[PDB]
Write an enzyme that holds these catalytic residues in place. Structure first.
Site, mmCIF file in Angstrom:
data_model
loop_
_atom_site.group_PDB
_atom_site.id
_atom_site.type_symbol
_atom_site.label_atom_id
_atom_site.label_comp_id
_atom_site.label_asym_id
_atom_site.label_seq_id
_atom_site.Cartn_x
_atom_site.Cartn_y
_atom_site.Cartn_z
ATOM 1 N N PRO A 38 -9.165 6.933 -4.999
ATOM 2 C CG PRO A 38 -8.852 7.777 -7.113
ATOM 3 C CD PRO A 38 -8.637 8.123 -5.688
ATOM 4 C CG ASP A 39 -7.235 -0.090 -4.882
ATOM 5 O OD1 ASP A 39 -6.041 0.036 -4.548
ATOM 6 O OD2 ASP A 39 -7.807 -1.204 -4.922
ATOM 7 C CG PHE A 40 -1.969 3.529 -5.230
ATOM 8 C CD1 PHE A 40 -1.125 2.447 -4.981
ATOM 9 C CD2 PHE A 40 -2.150 4.463 -4.224
ATOM 10 C CE1 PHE A 40 -0.502 2.290 -3.748
ATOM 11 C CE2 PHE A 40 -1.541 4.309 -2.986
ATOM 12 C CZ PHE A 40 -0.718 3.210 -2.753
ATOM 13 N NE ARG A 41 -1.425 -0.755 -1.630
ATOM 14 C CZ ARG A 41 -2.237 -0.094 -0.818
ATOM 15 N NH1 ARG A 41 -3.548 -0.317 -0.815
ATOM 16 N NH2 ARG A 41 -1.725 0.795 0.030
ATOM 17 C CG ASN A 112 -7.311 2.571 2.951
ATOM 18 O OD1 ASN A 112 -6.960 1.833 2.031
ATOM 19 N ND2 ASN A 112 -8.568 2.649 3.367
ATOM 20 C CG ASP A 114 -7.581 7.280 3.444
ATOM 21 O OD1 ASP A 114 -7.570 7.080 4.679
ATOM 22 O OD2 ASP A 114 -8.313 6.633 2.673
ATOM 23 C CG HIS A 131 0.521 -0.774 2.400
ATOM 24 N ND1 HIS A 131 1.494 -1.468 1.712
ATOM 25 C CD2 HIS A 131 -0.542 -1.609 2.497
ATOM 26 C CE1 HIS A 131 1.034 -2.668 1.399
ATOM 27 N NE2 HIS A 131 -0.190 -2.787 1.888
HETATM 28 C C1 LIG Z 1 -3.443 12.431 3.156
HETATM 29 C C2 LIG Z 1 -3.190 12.020 1.735
HETATM 30 C C3 LIG Z 1 -2.310 12.705 0.917
HETATM 31 C C4 LIG Z 1 -2.139 12.260 -0.382
HETATM 32 C C5 LIG Z 1 -1.208 12.944 -1.337
HETATM 33 N N1 LIG Z 1 -2.806 11.189 -0.849
HETATM 34 C C6 LIG Z 1 -3.629 10.599 0.021
HETATM 35 S S1 LIG Z 1 -4.516 9.204 -0.564
HETATM 36 C C7 LIG Z 1 -4.354 9.383 -2.382
HETATM 37 C C8 LIG Z 1 -3.101 8.798 -3.007
HETATM 38 O O1 LIG Z 1 -3.116 7.730 -3.609
HETATM 39 N N2 LIG Z 1 -1.977 9.556 -2.849
HETATM 40 C C9 LIG Z 1 -0.695 9.169 -3.203
HETATM 41 N N3 LIG Z 1 0.313 9.977 -2.997
HETATM 42 C C10 LIG Z 1 1.480 9.378 -3.413
HETATM 43 C C11 LIG Z 1 1.383 8.126 -3.932
HETATM 44 C C12 LIG Z 1 2.480 7.235 -4.410
HETATM 45 C C13 LIG Z 1 3.100 6.349 -3.350
HETATM 46 C C14 LIG Z 1 4.475 6.155 -3.294
HETATM 47 C C15 LIG Z 1 5.038 5.346 -2.319
HETATM 48 C C16 LIG Z 1 4.237 4.713 -1.382
HETATM 49 C C17 LIG Z 1 2.865 4.905 -1.434
HETATM 50 O O2 LIG Z 1 1.975 4.326 -0.559
HETATM 51 C C18 LIG Z 1 2.424 3.254 0.265
HETATM 52 C C19 LIG Z 1 2.322 1.979 -0.501
HETATM 53 C C20 LIG Z 1 3.268 1.313 -1.225
HETATM 54 N N4 LIG Z 1 2.654 0.200 -1.662
HETATM 55 C C21 LIG Z 1 3.210 -0.917 -2.433
HETATM 56 C C22 LIG Z 1 2.391 -1.234 -3.661
HETATM 57 C C23 LIG Z 1 1.765 -2.464 -3.814
HETATM 58 C C24 LIG Z 1 1.011 -2.744 -4.940
HETATM 59 C C25 LIG Z 1 0.880 -1.784 -5.930
HETATM 60 O O3 LIG Z 1 0.245 -1.944 -7.135
HETATM 61 C C26 LIG Z 1 0.673 -1.097 -8.218
HETATM 62 C C27 LIG Z 1 -0.472 -0.926 -9.166
HETATM 63 N N5 LIG Z 1 -0.547 -2.019 -10.193
HETATM 64 C C28 LIG Z 1 -0.874 -3.345 -9.585
HETATM 65 C C29 LIG Z 1 -0.949 -4.398 -10.662
HETATM 66 O O4 LIG Z 1 -0.646 -3.852 -11.943
HETATM 67 C C30 LIG Z 1 -1.583 -2.830 -12.268
HETATM 68 C C31 LIG Z 1 -1.538 -1.704 -11.266
HETATM 69 C C32 LIG Z 1 1.496 -0.555 -5.789
HETATM 70 C C33 LIG Z 1 2.246 -0.290 -4.660
HETATM 71 N N6 LIG Z 1 1.380 0.161 -1.241
HETATM 72 N N7 LIG Z 1 1.179 1.248 -0.531
HETATM 73 C C34 LIG Z 1 2.295 5.715 -2.409
HETATM 74 S S2 LIG Z 1 -0.276 7.643 -3.915
HETATM 75 N N8 LIG Z 1 -3.866 10.947 1.290
#
Ligand SMILES: Cc1cc(C)nc(SCC(=O)Nc2ncc(Cc3cccc(OCc4cn(Cc5ccc(OCCN6CCOCC6)cc5)nn4)c3)s2)n1
Ligand SMILES: [Zn+2]
Length: 292
Positions: A38-41, A112, A114, A131
């Site tokens: 899933p798309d955490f952003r 991504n 992943d 990222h």
């Molecule tokens: C091989 C493998 C193993 C695993 C364990 N997992 C996967 S993949 C599966 C997945 O998710 N695993 C995760 N593990 C940890 C996670 C948390 C996390 C913490 C720090 C950095 C992360 O990543 C880089 C990143 C950072 N940023 C910035 C950003 C930008 C916009 C965002 O919007 C927030 C959501 N809001 C938006 C609007 O308001 C409503 C919702 C958030 C952050 N972007 N990227 C990740 S996530 N693969």
């Protein structure tokens, strides 16, 4: 203009002309949602609801480097919760592998973390991870910086042992870019070089709303065709530059194909005469991964 018509069919004809030698892929979470990631952003992510149980000071703390360094346990608990069940790249990932195989892929820029591009066979220098990535991790001590592979990090994540460096006992952090961290110099080095060379931009599975991807399509030369394969249109400039122009009377190079990335890549492959190659590759690789 370089496209004879603003359709997937026009892009396919362009790709098989002598003019199209260097393709840049810009890919986001939409190319891995069919792999179950899933798309955490996303505005509709359930992430923050699921973060409640970590009693964070605020939800965004999960992403912040300073919070991580003082309280790493929520991050590593979340990493266990979200760890992919399989590492099975999608039809879209293997379409990019075909681009590499056929000598067309200049670069894949990915949002991504992943590692699925690497599993599909794209190599380190093929990839710009905007990222970061879980593929490697590093000790956070400046005088040590010992590197650890994903197998090591996975074992620590699943055993619920906060990963500590074997040499100095500092925290070991996946090479994903937390809030408060800088993009590596390599991102800007690549961007500055690649977008002088690009003949075609393939934008797949990204809304282009988050930096640094939000800055990228304006870097392409004015003549370079840009094909978006995405569930919805994206990249047009906000009404209030180089944004996408799919539909104005002056549109000349931007094409939107609306649907799942797997279906769009299958359709483009089919126009290119690659459908059998792509189906055979995906069926073989998926069967092998299901066997693991
Ligand atoms: C091989 C493998 C193993 C695993 C364990 N997992 C996967 S993949 C599966 C997945 O998710 N695993 C995760 N593990 C940890 C996670 C948390 C996390 C913490 C720090 C950095 C992360 O990543 C880089 C990143 C950072 N940023 C910035 C950003 C930008 C916009 C965002 O919007 C927030 C959501 N809001 C938006 C609007 O308001 C409503 C919702 C958030 C952050 N972007 N990227 C990740 S996530 N693969
Ligand atoms: Zn260390």
């Amino acid at each position: 203009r370089l496209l004879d018509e603003l359709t997937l069919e026009g892009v396919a004809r362009y790709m098989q002309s002598e003019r199209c030698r260097r393709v840049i892929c810009l890919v986001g979470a939409g190319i891995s949602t069919s792999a179950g990631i899933p798309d955490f952003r996303s505005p509709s992510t359930g992430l923050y609801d699921n973060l409640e149980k970590y009693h964070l000071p605020y939800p965004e703390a999960i992403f912040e480097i300073s919070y991580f360094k003082k309280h790493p346990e929520p991050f590593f608990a979340l990493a266990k919760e979200l760890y992919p069940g399989q590492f099975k790249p999608t039809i879209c990932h293997y379409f990019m592998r075909l681009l590499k195989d056929k000598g067309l892929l200049l670069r894949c820029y990915t949002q991504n973390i992943d590692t699925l591009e690497r599993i599909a066979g794209l190599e380190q220098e093929d990839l710009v991870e905007a990222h970061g990535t879980f593929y490697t991790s590093h000790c956070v001590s400046a005088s040590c910086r010992h590197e650890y592979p994903l197998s090591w990090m996975k074992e620590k994540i699943f055993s619920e042992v906060t990963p500590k460096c074997e040499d100095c006992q500092s925290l070991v952090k996946p090479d994903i870019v937390f809030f408060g961290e800088s993009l590596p110099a390599r991102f800007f080095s690549c961007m500055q070089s690649d977008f002088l060379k690009v003949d075609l931009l393939l934008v797949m599975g990204t809304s282009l709303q988050v930096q640094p991807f939000a800055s990228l399509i304006s870097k392409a030369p004015l003549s370079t065709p840009r094909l978006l394969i995405n569930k919805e249109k994206a990249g047009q400039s906000d009404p209030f530059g180089g944004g996408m122009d799919f539909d104005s009377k002056k549109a000349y190079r931007d094409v939107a194909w609306l649907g799942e990335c797997d279906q769009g890549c299958l359709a483009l492959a089919e126009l290119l005469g690659w459908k059998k190659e792509l189906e055979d590759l995906v069926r073989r690789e998926h069967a092998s991964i299901d066997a693991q």
